[PDB]
Amino acid sequence: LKLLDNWDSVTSTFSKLREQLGPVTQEFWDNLEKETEGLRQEMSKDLEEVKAKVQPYLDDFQKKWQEEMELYRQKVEPLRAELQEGARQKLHELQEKLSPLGEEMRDRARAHVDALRTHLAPYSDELRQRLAARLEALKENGGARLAEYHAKATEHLSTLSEKAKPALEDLRQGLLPVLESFKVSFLSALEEYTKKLN
Amino acid sequence: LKLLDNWDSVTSTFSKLREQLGPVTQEFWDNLEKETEGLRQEMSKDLEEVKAKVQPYLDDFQKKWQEEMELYRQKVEPLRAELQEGARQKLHELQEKLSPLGEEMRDRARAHVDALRTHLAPYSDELRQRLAARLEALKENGGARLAEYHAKATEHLSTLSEKAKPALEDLRQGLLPVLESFKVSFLSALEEYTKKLN
Ligand SMILES: CCCCCCCC/C=C\CCCCCCCC(=O)OC[C@H](COP(=O)(O)OCC[N+](C)(C)C)OC(=O)CCCCCCC/C=C\CCCCCCCC
Ligand SMILES: CCCCCCCC/C=C\CCCCCCCC(=O)OC[C@H](COP(=O)(O)OCC[N+](C)(C)C)OC(=O)CCCCCCC/C=C\CCCCCCCC
Ligand SMILES: CCCCCCCC/C=C\CCCCCCCC(=O)OC[C@H](COP(=O)(O)OCC[N+](C)(C)C)OC(=O)CCCCCCC/C=C\CCCCCCCC
Ligand SMILES: CCCCCCCC/C=C\CCCCCCCC(=O)OC[C@H](COP(=O)(O)OCC[N+](C)(C)C)OC(=O)CCCCCCC/C=C\CCCCCCCC
Ligand SMILES: CCCCCCCC/C=C\CCCCCCCC(=O)OC[C@H](COP(=O)(O)OCC[N+](C)(C)C)OC(=O)CCCCCCC/C=C\CCCCCCCC
Ligand SMILES: CCCCCCCC/C=C\CCCCCCCC(=O)OC[C@H](COP(=O)(O)OCC[N+](C)(C)C)OC(=O)CCCCCCC/C=C\CCCCCCCC
Ligand SMILES: CCCCCCCC/C=C\CCCCCCCC(=O)OC[C@H](COP(=O)(O)OCC[N+](C)(C)C)OC(=O)CCCCCCC/C=C\CCCCCCCC
Ligand SMILES: CCCCCCCC/C=C\CCCCCCCC(=O)OC[C@H](COP(=O)(O)OCC[N+](C)(C)C)OC(=O)CCCCCCC/C=C\CCCCCCCC
Ligand SMILES: CCCCCCCC/C=C\CCCCCCCC(=O)OC[C@H](COP(=O)(O)OCC[N+](C)(C)C)OC(=O)CCCCCCC/C=C\CCCCCCCC
Ligand SMILES: CCCCCCCC/C=C\CCCCCCCC(=O)OC[C@H](COP(=O)(O)OC[C@H](N)C(=O)O)OC(=O)CCCCCCC/C=C\CCCCCCCC
Ligand SMILES: CCCCCCCC/C=C\CCCCCCCC(=O)OC[C@H](COP(=O)(O)OC[C@H](N)C(=O)O)OC(=O)CCCCCCC/C=C\CCCCCCCC
């Protein structure tokens, strides 16, 4: 009955909470009305003054910004001209540079890769010999290693069968009485669990 | 007793593990010897080929690096000049911007900031005038609420104590038989558990 007795004190408090919620909501809204009323009076001033003054605000800034934009455009043109004239020369110089230097770079690139070709041909061939020597050795060595590992695997499995059979047998044989002792204690423990659970 | 047999079986598996590793390690050493011997014939050629490859490689790469160094010198040198000229031109281009537009922007800033003075100053005072009433509302309604909260505080304390008195007495009156029966449950549980856990 702990739930009922305690819940009774909870239901009564909740009821008393409503008894306090009533007046509190009335007083809260009562004062909130005064707040909204004052805030409305202030807001009327806020909006009116902000709006009436927003005109000269935006007008002043817009008129100035208008000139600013005009001056900006009046500058953008000659400034872009300087940039254009400059770009024409700068790009021309770069063009007149990328042409000879491009040819030179391409020519040097030719020798760069071509001289590399003269080395790549033998280099790759030598690598083939080295790789073949390694692969051939690793193949014979591999065959031996495979046999070695296979033999070790056989001995590993043979000695493992001597564990998978006798050792596991002993483990399984021990599991029987072990499970018995466990079941006996578990079954008896279940009694306590249920007994203490009511 | 079980742990004794368990460890006993582990002992047998250990001997048939260590002795298994006997020939295994001996053969593995020979196996490793094979790899080592192979590498003794592989790496010898590998290193010799590497030496006879890295030498002409670095040599030819030196030519390439020289080609590139010359290339970069023949590029960076004139490009540094062209870039300096172009940058100096751009600097002058910017100079004819940062100064004219700078003084212009400064005047724009004056027009903005000064306007802000005659726009934010009165606005701040307006805000104060509106905030004054706002604060007044918070003082009047605030003080009222403070009183309402005070009244409700007493009503809260009275209701809390109205519960605290019977609730604490009832809780203590409930905890007595509850803890008493719980103790009986604990005592029996302790005994029952010590009978199984042994
Ligand atoms: C049928 C069965 C029914 C039973 C139901 C019970 C219902 C509840 C009713 C009654 C419970 C009675 C328990 C009263 C406990 C009193 C603990 C207390 O008097 O303690 C004192 C400590 C003081 O300081 P100290 O002694 O440690 O320091 C020593 C430091 N030297 C000295 C320097 C200062 O107070 C501290 O430490 C304060 C630490 C504050 C930690 C707050 C943790 C907040 C986070 C999570 C809350 C989790 C809620 C669970 C959510 C559900 C998850 C599933
Ligand atoms: C003396 C004691 C000291 C402690 C102080 C007082 C704390 C309040 C105390 C006790 C709470 C009363 C007990 C709760 C009553 C249960 C009401 C209920 O049954 O409720 C359910 C709803 C719906 O939820 P549902 O769809 O999952 O369940 C639907 C369920 N099914 C799954 C069937 C569909 O749950 C809802 O309404 C819950 C929504 C979340 C409610 C948040 C309330 C936050 C309160 C104040 C912050 C407000 C500040 C205001 C300023 C605003 C500025 C913008
Ligand atoms: C505890 C510590 C907290 C720390 C917080 C720091 C304070 C930061 C201050 C303010 C944060 C602003 C956010 C609060 C506003 C949430 C109002 C609310 O509850 O939003 C949700 C409700 C629920 O409907 P819904 O969104 O799901 O549906 C609409 C569905 N449709 C659009 C999608 C299709 O939306 C509705 O009821 C619809 C809209 C109702 C409009 C309410 C706003 C009225 C305006 C002014 C009242 C206050 C003026 C006071 C100014 C000075 C304050 C100092
Ligand atoms: C201890 C230290 C030792 C020092 C040793 C020295 C290193 C040996 C020196 C030089 C050897 C260079 C060998 C590789 C150079 C050739 C790169 C090349 O031209 O390859 C051709 C591929 C062909 O692609 P596709 O046109 O048919 O396909 C496009 C078709 N669609 C779009 C359908 C996907 O092009 C591509 O993959 C490129 C396009 C996609 C990019 C993929 C990722 C590229 C990044 C890195 C690769 C760098 C390898 C360099 C290291 C060499 C190790 C020997
Ligand atoms: C001999 C001694 C043996 C030991 C026995 C006792 C161990 C009890 C331990 C853990 C389990 C929690 C027990 C809660 C009982 C069920 C409440 C319930 O029926 O629950 C419904 C919700 C709904 O979800 P669903 O239908 O999708 O899942 C259901 C999933 N279907 C059906 C596949 C299964 O299931 C959920 O919540 C499921 C999530 C897990 C339950 C979490 C809630 C646990 C209760 C209280 C924690 C208090 C938190 C306090 C508030 C903190 C605020 C900060
Ligand atoms: C193509 C046209 C040519 C362009 C010309 C540039 C050519 C490249 C040359 C120089 C650039 C410098 C690179 C910056 C890297 C390190 C910055 C640094 O060391 O940082 C930490 C310092 C610590 O403070 P401290 O008191 O110890 O150092 C003050 C004492 N001192 C200045 C003697 C060191 O912080 C400082 O120096 C504070 C940094 C504030 C810097 C304000 C510069 C304002 C001028 C112009 C604005 C330009 C806008 C245009 C952008 C578009 C370009 C396309
Ligand atoms: C001197 C006088 C005093 C004034 C002081 C300032 C006080 C602030 C109070 C009131 C003024 C704000 C009220 C008006 C705001 C509404 C602006 C508006 O017209 O709203 C609507 C837009 C619409 O959506 P749309 O234009 O994208 O779509 C267009 C359509 N389309 C998708 C289709 C293509 O929605 C938007 O503008 C979305 C805006 C919400 C996003 C806010 C994100 C802010 C970012 C960072 C804040 C950092 C927080 C981290 C903490 C550090 C703090 C330092
Ligand atoms: C129903 C009317 C009862 C009124 C109060 C009585 C009991 C309090 C009950 C509920 C309040 C729960 C909210 C959290 C309470 C924290 C308790 C705590 O553990 O507090 C100490 C910790 C220590 O941290 P600290 O030393 O760094 O901070 C303090 C330093 N500080 C001033 C310099 C910055 O502070 C913190 O956790 C930070 C917050 C501490 C807030 C202190 C404000 C105290 C205000 C007034 C004193 C009592 C007026 C009583 C009215 C008469 C009613 C009849
Ligand atoms: C169902 C869903 C709803 C459930 C909600 C849960 C309701 C519980 C809510 C709030 C109460 C939290 C309690 C914290 C206040 C302590 C009251 C108290 O036991 O204080 C006596 C102590 C004595 O000193 P000491 O060193 O031994 O203790 C410090 C202990 N140590 C050292 C271990 C840290 O003094 C202090 O802690 C220093 C006094 C600090 C004064 C703080 C006053 C703050 C004022 C207003 C904040 C508003 C709270 C509103 C919530 C209540 C509405 C009715
Ligand atoms: C995602 C990232 C992309 C890369 C971005 C790079 C941006 C860099 C930003 C600004 C320019 C920086 C300009 C830096 C100029 C200074 C270069 C120089 O000598 O620096 C000195 C450092 C010295 O390091 P130390 O560790 O020795 O000393 C530090 C010391 N321990 C301490 O605690 O203080 O050496 C080093 O940094 C390491 C070796 C450098 C060798 C140079 C190698 C340069 C080689 C060639 C030139 C560059 C190629 C240009 C290609 C165009 C032409 C073809
Ligand atoms: C889900 C859990 C619900 C219960 C929860 C309880 C607490 C929950 C709260 C927090 C979690 C706990 C978090 C604990 C964190 C660490 C606690 C701690 O300090 O542990 C260390 C100690 C010390 O061990 P050491 O003993 O080996 O010796 C000293 C130690 N090195 C030192 O430097 O001090 O260990 C000991 O106390 C050993 C003594 C054991 C006593 C024998 C006890 C004998 C117990 C049982 C025997 C019966 C079984 C019979 C089986 C049948 C026969 C085979």
Side-chain angles (χ1 to χ4, degrees), chain A residues 141-162:
Chain A
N141 207 329
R145 286 179 297 174
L146 288 171
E148 291 270 3
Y149 298 146
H150 204 265
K152 289 151 201 47
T154 307
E155 283 297 290
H156 216 69
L157 288 175
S158 40
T159 52
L160 262 179
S161 72
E162 302 183 88

PDB file of all heavy atoms in Angstrom, chain A residues 141-162:
ATOM      1  N   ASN A 141      63.013 -21.599 -52.689  1.00  0.00           N
ATOM      2  CA  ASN A 141      63.003 -21.374 -51.252  1.00  0.00           C
ATOM      3  C   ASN A 141      61.576 -21.539 -50.762  1.00  0.00           C
ATOM      4  O   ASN A 141      61.325 -22.066 -49.687  1.00  0.00           O
ATOM      5  CB  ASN A 141      63.476 -19.944 -50.961  1.00  0.00           C
ATOM      6  CG  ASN A 141      64.117 -19.777 -49.599  1.00  0.00           C
ATOM      7  OD1 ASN A 141      63.766 -20.462 -48.644  1.00  0.00           O
ATOM      8  ND2 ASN A 141      65.058 -18.848 -49.508  1.00  0.00           N
ATOM      9  N   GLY A 142      60.637 -21.088 -51.587  1.00  0.00           N
ATOM     10  CA  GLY A 142      59.231 -21.192 -51.268  1.00  0.00           C
ATOM     11  C   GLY A 142      58.785 -22.629 -51.228  1.00  0.00           C
ATOM     12  O   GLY A 142      58.064 -23.023 -50.323  1.00  0.00           O
ATOM     13  N   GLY A 143      59.221 -23.415 -52.207  1.00  0.00           N
ATOM     14  CA  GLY A 143      58.868 -24.820 -52.242  1.00  0.00           C
ATOM     15  C   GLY A 143      59.369 -25.517 -50.999  1.00  0.00           C
ATOM     16  O   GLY A 143      58.655 -26.318 -50.391  1.00  0.00           O
ATOM     17  N   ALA A 144      60.600 -25.195 -50.618  1.00  0.00           N
ATOM     18  CA  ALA A 144      61.204 -25.757 -49.424  1.00  0.00           C
ATOM     19  C   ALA A 144      60.437 -25.281 -48.197  1.00  0.00           C
ATOM     20  O   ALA A 144      60.055 -26.081 -47.348  1.00  0.00           O
ATOM     21  CB  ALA A 144      62.665 -25.347 -49.328  1.00  0.00           C
ATOM     22  N   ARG A 145      60.193 -23.970 -48.130  1.00  0.00           N
ATOM     23  CA  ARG A 145      59.457 -23.370 -47.019  1.00  0.00           C
ATOM     24  C   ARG A 145      58.069 -23.984 -46.886  1.00  0.00           C
ATOM     25  O   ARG A 145      57.619 -24.281 -45.784  1.00  0.00           O
ATOM     26  CB  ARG A 145      59.345 -21.850 -47.186  1.00  0.00           C
ATOM     27  CG  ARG A 145      60.637 -21.093 -46.916  1.00  0.00           C
ATOM     28  CD  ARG A 145      60.465 -19.597 -47.134  1.00  0.00           C
ATOM     29  NE  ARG A 145      60.120 -19.269 -48.522  1.00  0.00           N
ATOM     30  CZ  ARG A 145      59.805 -18.039 -48.941  1.00  0.00           C
ATOM     31  NH1 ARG A 145      59.828 -17.016 -48.094  1.00  0.00           N
ATOM     32  NH2 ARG A 145      59.488 -17.823 -50.214  1.00  0.00           N
ATOM     33  N   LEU A 146      57.394 -24.178 -48.016  1.00  0.00           N
ATOM     34  CA  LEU A 146      56.062 -24.770 -48.020  1.00  0.00           C
ATOM     35  C   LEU A 146      56.105 -26.172 -47.434  1.00  0.00           C
ATOM     36  O   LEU A 146      55.241 -26.549 -46.645  1.00  0.00           O
ATOM     37  CB  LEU A 146      55.476 -24.797 -49.433  1.00  0.00           C
ATOM     38  CG  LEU A 146      55.041 -23.446 -50.011  1.00  0.00           C
ATOM     39  CD1 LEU A 146      54.694 -23.583 -51.484  1.00  0.00           C
ATOM     40  CD2 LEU A 146      53.863 -22.883 -49.232  1.00  0.00           C
ATOM     41  N   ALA A 147      57.127 -26.934 -47.814  1.00  0.00           N
ATOM     42  CA  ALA A 147      57.301 -28.285 -47.303  1.00  0.00           C
ATOM     43  C   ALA A 147      57.600 -28.214 -45.815  1.00  0.00           C
ATOM     44  O   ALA A 147      57.040 -28.969 -45.017  1.00  0.00           O
ATOM     45  CB  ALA A 147      58.432 -28.984 -48.040  1.00  0.00           C
ATOM     46  N   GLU A 148      58.481 -27.285 -45.452  1.00  0.00           N
ATOM     47  CA  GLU A 148      58.855 -27.067 -44.063  1.00  0.00           C
ATOM     48  C   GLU A 148      57.623 -26.753 -43.224  1.00  0.00           C
ATOM     49  O   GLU A 148      57.384 -27.386 -42.193  1.00  0.00           O
ATOM     50  CB  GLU A 148      59.849 -25.906 -43.956  1.00  0.00           C
ATOM     51  CG  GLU A 148      61.225 -26.203 -44.528  1.00  0.00           C
ATOM     52  CD  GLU A 148      62.174 -26.789 -43.507  1.00  0.00           C
ATOM     53  OE1 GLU A 148      61.742 -27.025 -42.359  1.00  0.00           O
ATOM     54  OE2 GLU A 148      63.355 -27.010 -43.854  1.00  0.00           O
ATOM     55  N   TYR A 149      56.849 -25.772 -43.671  1.00  0.00           N
ATOM     56  CA  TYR A 149      55.642 -25.364 -42.972  1.00  0.00           C
ATOM     57  C   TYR A 149      54.625 -26.495 -42.950  1.00  0.00           C
ATOM     58  O   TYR A 149      53.964 -26.716 -41.941  1.00  0.00           O
ATOM     59  CB  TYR A 149      55.039 -24.104 -43.600  1.00  0.00           C
ATOM     60  CG  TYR A 149      55.941 -22.886 -43.535  1.00  0.00           C
ATOM     61  CD1 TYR A 149      55.938 -21.940 -44.554  1.00  0.00           C
ATOM     62  CD2 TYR A 149      56.801 -22.687 -42.461  1.00  0.00           C
ATOM     63  CE1 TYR A 149      56.763 -20.830 -44.504  1.00  0.00           C
ATOM     64  CE2 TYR A 149      57.626 -21.580 -42.402  1.00  0.00           C
ATOM     65  CZ  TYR A 149      57.606 -20.656 -43.427  1.00  0.00           C
ATOM     66  OH  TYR A 149      58.432 -19.554 -43.371  1.00  0.00           O
ATOM     67  N   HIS A 150      54.518 -27.219 -44.058  1.00  0.00           N
ATOM     68  CA  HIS A 150      53.584 -28.336 -44.151  1.00  0.00           C
ATOM     69  C   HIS A 150      53.942 -29.405 -43.128  1.00  0.00           C
ATOM     70  O   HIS A 150      53.070 -29.925 -42.437  1.00  0.00           O
ATOM     71  CB  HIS A 150      53.570 -28.931 -45.563  1.00  0.00           C
ATOM     72  CG  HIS A 150      52.303 -29.655 -45.900  1.00  0.00           C
ATOM     73  ND1 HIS A 150      52.145 -31.016 -45.758  1.00  0.00           N
ATOM     74  CD2 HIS A 150      51.122 -29.194 -46.381  1.00  0.00           C
ATOM     75  CE1 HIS A 150      50.931 -31.360 -46.136  1.00  0.00           C
ATOM     76  NE2 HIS A 150      50.285 -30.274 -46.520  1.00  0.00           N
ATOM     77  N   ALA A 151      55.232 -29.713 -43.025  1.00  0.00           N
ATOM     78  CA  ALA A 151      55.712 -30.707 -42.070  1.00  0.00           C
ATOM     79  C   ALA A 151      55.418 -30.246 -40.647  1.00  0.00           C
ATOM     80  O   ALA A 151      54.956 -31.022 -39.808  1.00  0.00           O
ATOM     81  CB  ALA A 151      57.203 -30.950 -42.258  1.00  0.00           C
ATOM     82  N   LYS A 152      55.670 -28.967 -40.391  1.00  0.00           N
ATOM     83  CA  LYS A 152      55.416 -28.388 -39.077  1.00  0.00           C
ATOM     84  C   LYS A 152      53.922 -28.396 -38.787  1.00  0.00           C
ATOM     85  O   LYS A 152      53.505 -28.585 -37.649  1.00  0.00           O
ATOM     86  CB  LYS A 152      55.973 -26.968 -38.991  1.00  0.00           C
ATOM     87  CG  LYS A 152      57.488 -26.911 -38.944  1.00  0.00           C
ATOM     88  CD  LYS A 152      58.013 -25.627 -39.563  1.00  0.00           C
ATOM     89  CE  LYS A 152      59.468 -25.774 -39.978  1.00  0.00           C
ATOM     90  NZ  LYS A 152      59.705 -27.042 -40.726  1.00  0.00           N
ATOM     91  N   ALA A 153      53.124 -28.179 -39.829  1.00  0.00           N
ATOM     92  CA  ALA A 153      51.673 -28.187 -39.702  1.00  0.00           C
ATOM     93  C   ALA A 153      51.203 -29.591 -39.362  1.00  0.00           C
ATOM     94  O   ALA A 153      50.311 -29.772 -38.541  1.00  0.00           O
ATOM     95  CB  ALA A 153      51.012 -27.697 -40.984  1.00  0.00           C
ATOM     96  N   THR A 154      51.826 -30.587 -39.989  1.00  0.00           N
ATOM     97  CA  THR A 154      51.493 -31.978 -39.735  1.00  0.00           C
ATOM     98  C   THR A 154      51.803 -32.320 -38.282  1.00  0.00           C
ATOM     99  O   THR A 154      50.975 -32.903 -37.586  1.00  0.00           O
ATOM    100  CB  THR A 154      52.265 -32.920 -40.681  1.00  0.00           C
ATOM    101  OG1 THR A 154      52.044 -32.505 -42.036  1.00  0.00           O
ATOM    102  CG2 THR A 154      51.795 -34.357 -40.520  1.00  0.00           C
ATOM    103  N   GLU A 155      52.989 -31.926 -37.821  1.00  0.00           N
ATOM    104  CA  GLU A 155      53.394 -32.168 -36.438  1.00  0.00           C
ATOM    105  C   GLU A 155      52.526 -31.353 -35.482  1.00  0.00           C
ATOM    106  O   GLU A 155      52.274 -31.756 -34.345  1.00  0.00           O
ATOM    107  CB  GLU A 155      54.872 -31.824 -36.236  1.00  0.00           C
ATOM    108  CG  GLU A 155      55.833 -32.873 -36.775  1.00  0.00           C
ATOM    109  CD  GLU A 155      55.695 -34.211 -36.071  1.00  0.00           C
ATOM    110  OE1 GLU A 155      56.069 -34.309 -34.884  1.00  0.00           O
ATOM    111  OE2 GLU A 155      55.216 -35.175 -36.705  1.00  0.00           O
ATOM    112  N   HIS A 156      52.066 -30.204 -35.956  1.00  0.00           N
ATOM    113  CA  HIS A 156      51.215 -29.335 -35.166  1.00  0.00           C
ATOM    114  C   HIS A 156      49.843 -29.971 -35.013  1.00  0.00           C
ATOM    115  O   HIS A 156      49.242 -29.911 -33.946  1.00  0.00           O
ATOM    116  CB  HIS A 156      51.079 -27.967 -35.839  1.00  0.00           C
ATOM    117  CG  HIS A 156      51.021 -26.811 -34.886  1.00  0.00           C
ATOM    118  ND1 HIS A 156      52.101 -26.405 -34.138  1.00  0.00           N
ATOM    119  CD2 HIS A 156      50.011 -25.963 -34.574  1.00  0.00           C
ATOM    120  CE1 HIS A 156      51.763 -25.363 -33.409  1.00  0.00           C
ATOM    121  NE2 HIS A 156      50.501 -25.070 -33.653  1.00  0.00           N
ATOM    122  N   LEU A 157      49.368 -30.588 -36.090  1.00  0.00           N
ATOM    123  CA  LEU A 157      48.070 -31.239 -36.094  1.00  0.00           C
ATOM    124  C   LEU A 157      48.106 -32.558 -35.335  1.00  0.00           C
ATOM    125  O   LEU A 157      47.154 -32.896 -34.631  1.00  0.00           O
ATOM    126  CB  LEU A 157      47.562 -31.438 -37.521  1.00  0.00           C
ATOM    127  CG  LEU A 157      47.110 -30.173 -38.256  1.00  0.00           C
ATOM    128  CD1 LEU A 157      46.739 -30.492 -39.695  1.00  0.00           C
ATOM    129  CD2 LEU A 157      45.939 -29.521 -37.536  1.00  0.00           C
ATOM    130  N   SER A 158      49.201 -33.304 -35.467  1.00  0.00           N
ATOM    131  CA  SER A 158      49.335 -34.572 -34.766  1.00  0.00           C
ATOM    132  C   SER A 158      49.323 -34.334 -33.264  1.00  0.00           C
ATOM    133  O   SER A 158      48.562 -34.964 -32.529  1.00  0.00           O
ATOM    134  CB  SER A 158      50.599 -35.318 -35.198  1.00  0.00           C
ATOM    135  OG  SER A 158      51.690 -34.436 -35.355  1.00  0.00           O
ATOM    136  N   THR A 159      50.138 -33.387 -32.815  1.00  0.00           N
ATOM    137  CA  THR A 159      50.204 -33.054 -31.404  1.00  0.00           C
ATOM    138  C   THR A 159      48.903 -32.390 -30.956  1.00  0.00           C
ATOM    139  O   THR A 159      48.578 -32.371 -29.768  1.00  0.00           O
ATOM    140  CB  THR A 159      51.392 -32.133 -31.083  1.00  0.00           C
ATOM    141  OG1 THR A 159      51.379 -31.003 -31.960  1.00  0.00           O
ATOM    142  CG2 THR A 159      52.705 -32.880 -31.240  1.00  0.00           C
ATOM    143  N   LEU A 160      48.174 -31.821 -31.915  1.00  0.00           N
ATOM    144  CA  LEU A 160      46.899 -31.183 -31.626  1.00  0.00           C
ATOM    145  C   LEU A 160      45.826 -32.241 -31.426  1.00  0.00           C
ATOM    146  O   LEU A 160      44.946 -32.078 -30.588  1.00  0.00           O
ATOM    147  CB  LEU A 160      46.477 -30.204 -32.725  1.00  0.00           C
ATOM    148  CG  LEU A 160      46.790 -28.724 -32.471  1.00  0.00           C
ATOM    149  CD1 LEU A 160      46.342 -27.870 -33.649  1.00  0.00           C
ATOM    150  CD2 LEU A 160      46.141 -28.248 -31.181  1.00  0.00           C
ATOM    151  N   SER A 161      45.903 -33.328 -32.186  1.00  0.00           N
ATOM    152  CA  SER A 161      44.935 -34.405 -32.049  1.00  0.00           C
ATOM    153  C   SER A 161      45.089 -35.039 -30.669  1.00  0.00           C
ATOM    154  O   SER A 161      44.122 -35.513 -30.071  1.00  0.00           O
ATOM    155  CB  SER A 161      45.092 -35.445 -33.167  1.00  0.00           C
ATOM    156  OG  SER A 161      46.268 -36.220 -33.008  1.00  0.00           O
ATOM    157  N   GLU A 162      46.317 -34.993 -30.151  1.00  0.00           N
ATOM    158  CA  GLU A 162      46.628 -35.522 -28.831  1.00  0.00           C
ATOM    159  C   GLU A 162      46.089 -34.585 -27.748  1.00  0.00           C
ATOM    160  O   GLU A 162      46.226 -34.843 -26.555  1.00  0.00           O
ATOM    161  CB  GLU A 162      48.138 -35.708 -28.675  1.00  0.00           C
ATOM    162  CG  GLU A 162      48.755 -36.621 -29.722  1.00  0.00           C
ATOM    163  CD  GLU A 162      50.236 -36.848 -29.501  1.00  0.00           C
ATOM    164  OE1 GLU A 162      50.591 -37.788 -28.764  1.00  0.00           O
ATOM    165  OE2 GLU A 162      51.049 -36.082 -30.060  1.00  0.00           O
TER     166      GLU A 162
END
